[PDB]
Amino acid sequence: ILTDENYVDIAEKAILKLERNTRNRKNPDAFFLTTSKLRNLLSLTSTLFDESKVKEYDALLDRIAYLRVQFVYQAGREIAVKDLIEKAQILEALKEIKDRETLQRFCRYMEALVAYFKFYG
Amino acid sequence: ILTDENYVDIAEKAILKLERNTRNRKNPDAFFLTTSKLRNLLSLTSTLFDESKVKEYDALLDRIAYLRVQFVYQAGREIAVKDLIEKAQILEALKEIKDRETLQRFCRYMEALVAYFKFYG
Amino acid sequence: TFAKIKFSAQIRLETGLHIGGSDAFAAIGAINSPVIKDPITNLPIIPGSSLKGKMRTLLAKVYNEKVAEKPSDDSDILSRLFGNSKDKRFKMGRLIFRDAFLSNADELDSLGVRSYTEVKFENTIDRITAEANPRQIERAIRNSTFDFELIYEITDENENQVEEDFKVIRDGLKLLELDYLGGSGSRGYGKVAFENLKATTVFGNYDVKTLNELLTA
Amino acid sequence: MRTLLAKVYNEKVAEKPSDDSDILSRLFGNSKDKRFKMGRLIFRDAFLSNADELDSLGVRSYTEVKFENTIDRITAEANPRQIERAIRNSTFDFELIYEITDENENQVEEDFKVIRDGLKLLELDYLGGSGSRGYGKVAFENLKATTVFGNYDVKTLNELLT
Amino acid sequence: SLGVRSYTEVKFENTIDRITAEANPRQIERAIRNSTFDFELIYEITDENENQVEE
Amino acid sequence: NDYRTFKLSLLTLAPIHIGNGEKYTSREFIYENKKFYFPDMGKFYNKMVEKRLAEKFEAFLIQTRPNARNNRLISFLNDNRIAERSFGGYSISETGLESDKNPNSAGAINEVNKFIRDAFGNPYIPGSSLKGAIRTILMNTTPKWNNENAVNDFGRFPKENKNLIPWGPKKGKEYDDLFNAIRVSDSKPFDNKSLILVQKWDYSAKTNKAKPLPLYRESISPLTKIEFEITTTTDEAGRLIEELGKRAQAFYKDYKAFFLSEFPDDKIQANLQYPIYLGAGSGAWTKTLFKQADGILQRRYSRMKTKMVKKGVLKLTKAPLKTVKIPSGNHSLVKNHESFYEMGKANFMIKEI
RNA sequence: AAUGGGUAAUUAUAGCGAGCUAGAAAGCGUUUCCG
RNA sequence: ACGGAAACGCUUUCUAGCUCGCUAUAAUUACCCAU
């Protein structure tokens, strides 16, 4: 669950809980999750955040249900993405996405994940 | 039947109902359905999902009727595919595929089946 | 005296070009790297930005001594036609690259065409251990002919050069045939021909009789 | 449309919009003249006419986003742009209020040589945004003049808008 | 209910100075379109009108 | 003007299959005459619904027979008297070496692959496929890239260091990117009639019988001339392309040293030009910088399809026998009878402009 | 031994995610009625 | 017989100039299975 107050510090604490590359101490603290892998998940959400500002919710919810396909498929393979969606509660946040304000909150919640990934990188 | 809201959690509950390899407990919980077998069914649907975005429905419905050939032929042999199309209501979903929105829904419904197969594997 | 000069060339492919975009909600086991389409007709198009980005960056090795680090450092024969934002008098210079959409909609048909964009499966093979990594990218098909619509713009500053500023257009229409018009370029992907160029005067009553015959050599 | 018409009717390079000639300033208005304020033309914002005709066709959203990286010149890097622009065959209702003041005299027919030519340069140059990379190509269709305020006859004028 | 978060839009404009081509931006605030304002014009009748209440 | 092109005249001396990632299954082709026919199965289904056979046709695709020719699509035509060609028109001829030579099993092939095509239907060899063959030659015959490569540094060993040839934008420093300056173009679209649909034959050292295999790749017939334009810009990528006559032979001489030793010389054939291996054929030692992959490569197949105790298995076909007769006398083109070629063995010669 | 079948992997990977110019500029700051 | 009366916050102004969705990438690997 994430509200309009806490959808950022949940996303900050999520990135800090991503377990680093403790192996191979040359250039340490790198994440198993990589940048271009995470942007694939953002490009999904950062085209619904645009269309939610223009369209209504009911003419848009077909692409919203396909996020639950994509966030599982991108995490079902290449296990470092599964490390994200279990720690950052992505699949639980898609359970509560019933309105445009929450659609614009989760699509903005993903942008906080990309922000602190780039900051703590 | 599957609508724009429920075409994913039906597909999630379908994969969980696939009976595992309860025999041969070394590396357990493997499915009788395999990955490269399922991708043969997806490559059928994930080339109509491309052409539906470009072409109309009426100049495309010849390949749609041949899905009912393929999903029966691929399941008439090698019975683990028949375990899929009876549990995941594939042949019932092809009865209601009268429009581009439903064509893009079933072809997207198959992608949720491949997603949770890879995730629960 | 003010005049506008239009160039109605025809961009005909030989190897299919891939001016990409990104359909963000693509599919699994489908095209994960599409081409940019026309948003209504869903025909593949060539934007003017992919043309202007390949006209300039191939004429910046030929008509540019003291090779430029930035596009602002082009040596003021190239900036006179391609614009230069770091200059008092070269901003928006004299060329407009209109988008080349599609011409042969029904000449590709009656050759046998399912879709106007083909799909190519491509497989990054890992050298060690022979791992496979497939990808599916779209291409505009082979005999697709596009509508090149470059527009020149004559002021009273142009005097003697007018005609100097077409050999750079003619060579930009020639240095690109030796290259690829965008694309996953190294392998095929836009070895393209610029057929039957024609300059006309669409405003201001300027003569192009001596101007056309230097575009046919 | 002023700067396109500025390149035709000035006879010297106007460094200001006030330095445009007396045929531009009595249409688009001038602030330094106490005689050419309250300029003759009134341009209204154009809205989507065919929002229903773009519906029931192959497009869904009325804006498409174009992905447009640059390439660095010596190191060949990339910097991706996402420039939103309207879709291809959007049709916009355009209206062009002209005000026949009693000081107009015989200039009414001279202005329509200028406005039509301003509508003919916009069909050659672009309209807003990155115009040397596409993004322009405006076609003005169904050009016709009607009198929204009384006592003028446009019967011998709609042939100029052929 | 025709979702508008603030009743005044902010329009961004600029100016292209001639001969140098350097823009000069501007942010002017405008009330949005389907705002409906209530207008009350009051014509007062006295004995000094004398058949001028239709002219 | 820094560009300088080449003409790689690729001459197929072997069945060469390329691409398309999809396959005609069984019951999707009719063996009517001594030539195959691959219909449009959506167009085939629409005519047959109009001939009122759709319930019989789905009942046809579920029941198997002890015979095999009655489990192909031609039996559904003869049991219901279909008398038209008229479908999605694509047909190739055959040789008799596709199926088992014995007549009873003839025409009972299954699961053919497809060859890569444009949207017109005319096949071609793409430039992306020909460039991957060049890269392995340029991998294995440099002494600087064939080093102790494939450092994993994490997890499992199969991760090749792809950041060993510079290819990225590489910020700060100047963009070199050798393989951007090697620009392989596509083929000319050739004709369907040079397609013969060979099958894969496995051959090991022990168990000297060459076992059949149900791959049925529609391959290019040998002795077909295909040209390629390869344009190179810089000097370093300029020099590595005319050198290929000394690079591809040095590759194949190092590749004759093992996996083309320990075999009879009957199955292996001569070169007669500069040798090269296109896709979908002899793999994992041609699609591989092979010195550092031998120990590592066999880890992936501790399975039922187990890669052998030796390096690998020879990949063979059965294609019709042809000769070139270019030297003094007819060049015999094999060293055996019974029509064995090795799959993917191509040959070229290179020339500027 | 013949017969009849193919089967299993990967389904894109890594990078960039916008940069720089302008950020308002010219006028009018009370006029008329009035002593 | 209102510190009142008459008075448009208004005229002029393109969100514009420069910018390649590009870079590397053989649809390939393995050789059996059923009785």
Q: Which residues of F touch B72 (CB under 8 A)?
A: 58, 61-62
Interatomic CA distance for residues F62 and D131, integer angstroms: 61
Residue D30 near residue D39, CB atoms below 8 Å: yes
Domain end among F88, F117, F152: F88
Q: What's the number of domains chain A is made of?
A: 1
Q: Contact, F127 vs F228, CB < 8 A? A: yes
- Please, which residues have CB within 8 angstroms of residue F338's CB and are 6 or more apart in sequence? F318
Q: What amino acid is encoded at E10 in this protein? A: V
Distance CA A85, CA A80 (A): 9
DSSP symbol at C44: B
Domain that holds residue F72: 40-88
Task: With CB atoms and an 8 Å threshold, state whether D132 touches C68.
Answer: no
The tokens for B35 are 């990955």
CA of D146 to C1' of H20 (A): 47
For residues F349 and F324, the answer to whether their CB atoms sit within 8 Å is no
Domain boundaries defined on chain C: 1-217
Rounded distance between C-alpha atoms, residue F48 and residue F45, angstroms? 5
Q: Which residues of D21-55 are buried (b: 16+ CB within 10 A; e: fewer)?
A: eebbbbbbbbeeeeebeeebbeeeeeeeeeeeebe
- What kind of experiment solved this structure? cryo-EM
Chain F interface includes A22 (CB < 8 A): no
Q: Does B7 touch chain A (CB under 8 A)?
A: yes
Helices (H) and strands (E) counted in chain B, each on its own, are 7, 0
Torsion of CA D127, D129, D131, D137, to 10 degrees: -40
For residue C36, what is the DSSP state? P
Kindly tell me whether chain F and chain B come into contact, counting contact as 3+ Cβ pairs under 8 Å.
Answer: yes
Residues in chain B followed by a break, C to N above 2.5 angstroms: none
Give the Cα separation of F161 and F154 in Å (integer): 12
Query: Tokens 């995730």 label which residue?
Result: B119
Nearest residue in A to C32, CA atom: A40
CA nearest to F112, candidates F194, F200, F15, F44:
F200
Let me know whether F212 and F84 are in one domain. no
Distance CA D102, CA D152 (A): 12
With CA atoms as reference, the chain A residue closest to C27 would be A70
**How would DSSP label each residue in E1-55?**
----SSSEEEEEE----TTT-----EEEEEE-TT------------TT-SS-S--
Name, in order, each residue with C-beta under 8 angstroms of C42's C-beta and a sequence gap of 6 or more.
B53, B54, C116, D58
User: For chain A, percent helix, then strand, then coil, each to nearest 5?
Assistant: 60, 0, 35
Query: Residue F216: what residue type?
Result: Y
A36 interface with F at CB cutoff 8 Å: no
Are the CB atoms for F182 and F131 separated by under 8 Å? yes
- CA-nearest residue of chain A to B115? A73
* Long-range Cβ pairs for the range F151-157 (8 Å, 24+): F153/A24, F154/A21, F154/A23, F154/A24, F157/C129, F157/F296, F157/F299
Which ranges in A78-119 belong to alpha helices (H)?
82-87, 90-93, 100-119
- 3-state SS, chain F, equals CCCECCEEEEEECCCECCCCCCEECCCCCCCCECEEECCCHHHHHHHHHHCCCHHHHHHHCCCCCCCCHHHCHHHHHHCCCCCCCCCCCCEEECCCCCCCCCCCCCCCCCCEECCCECCCCCECCCHHHHHHHHHHHHHHCCCCCCCCCCCCCCCCCCCCCCCCCCCCCCCCCCCCCHHHCEEECCCCCCCHHHECCCCCEEECCCCCCCEECCCECCCECCCCEEEEEEEECCHHHHHHHHCHHHHHHHHHHHHHCCCCCCCCCCCCCCCCCEEEECCCCCCCCCCCCCCCCHHHHHHHHCCCCCCCCCCCCEEECCCCCCCCCCCCCCCCCCCCCCCCCECCEEEEECCCC
CA B39 → C1' G10, Å?
Answer: 11
Q: Which two tokens stand for residue D69?
A: 């990286």
Tokens of D83: 């420039």
Count CB atoms within 10 A of the CB of residue B76.
17
User: Which of F2, F127, F136 is closest, CB to CB, to C188?
Assistant: F127
Give the E-state strand segments of chain B in sequence order. Answer: none
CA-wise closest residue to F62 among C12, B76, A6:
B76
Q: Which of C175, C148, C144, C202 is nearest to C78 (CA)?
A: C175
Which residue in the block uniquely carries the two structure tokens 């030519």? D117
Handedness of CA B106, B112, B117, B120 (dihedral sign): negative
Chains contacting F (3 or more CB pairs within 8 Å): A, B, C, D
Residue of A nearest to F153 (CA): A24
Closest CA to F319 of F223, F252, F210, F192: F223
Distance F211 CA to G1 C1' (A): 14
Spatial distance between the Cα atoms of D13 and D25, rounded to a whole number of angstroms: 15
Element at C139 (helix H, strand E): strand C136-140
Nearest residue for G14, CA–C1': A36
Binary contact (C48, D124; C-beta < 8 A): no
Q: Tell me the residue range of the domain where A73 lies.
A: 1-121
Pairing of strands F182-184, F225-232: antiparallel
Helices F244-256 & F235-242 angle (0-180, nearest 10):
60
Chain F residues with CB under 8 Å of a chain A CB are: 153-154
Chains E and F touching, counted as 3 or more CB pairs less than 8 Å apart? no
Q: Residues, chain B, total?
A: 121
Q: Which of D140, C142, A76 is nearest to F117 (CA)?
A: C142
Cβ of C27 within 8 Å of Cβ of B39? The answer is no
Contact A68 B108 (CB under 8 A): no
- What φ, ψ does residue C191 adopt, rounded to 5°? -70, 90
Q: How far apart (Å, rounded) are the C-alpha atoms in residues F136 and F286?
A: 7
Name the nucleotide with the smallest C1'–CA separation from F19.
H27
Collect all residues from F whose CB is shorter than 8 A from any CB in B: 22, 25, 27, 41-43, 45-46, 49, 57-58, 61-62
CA distance D16 to E18: 6
Per the CB < 8 A criterion, the answer to whether F154 and A23 are in contact is yes
Asked if residue F66 and residue F23 are part of one domain, the reply reads no
F93, F83: one domain: no
**Taking a C-beta distance cutoff of 8 angstroms, is the pair F352, F6 a contact?**
yes
Q: DSSP letters of D133-152?
A: GS-------S-----SSSS-
CB-count exposure of residue B116 (10 Å: 0-12, 13-18, 19+): buried
Strand G bases, protein C-beta under 7 A:
1, 3-27
Pairing relation of β-strands F345-349 and F274-277?
A: antiparallel
Q: How far is the CA of C168 from the C1' of G10 (A)?
A: 47
Mark yes or no for CB contact C130/F283 under 8 Å.
yes
Structure resolution in Å?
3.4
- Residue of chain C whose Cα is closest to the Cα of A65: C25
- Helix or strand run (H / E) with residue B15: helix B9-17
Phi-psi region of C89 (alpha: psi -120 to 50; beta: other; left: phi over 0): alpha
What is the arrangement of strands in the sheet containing F211-212, beginning at the earlier edge strand?
F211-212, F201-203, F314-316
Residue in C178, C180, C174, C179 with CA at minimum distance from that of residue C197: C174
Residue F88's closest CA among F49, F140, F30, F17?
Answer: F30
Using CB atoms, pick whichever of B43, B72, B77 lies closest to residue F58. Answer: B72
Strand H positions within 7 A of protein Cβ atoms: 8, 11-33
Dmax (CA) for chain A in angstroms is 51
Taking the CA of residue C79 and the nearest CA in chain F, the distance in Å comes to: 22
F185 and F74 in a common domain: no
Other beta carbons less than 10 A from residue B5's beta carbon: 12
| F289/F291 Cα distance (integer angstroms) | 6
CA–CA separation, F41 and A119 (whole Å): 54
CB pair distance less than 8 Å for A61 and B5: yes
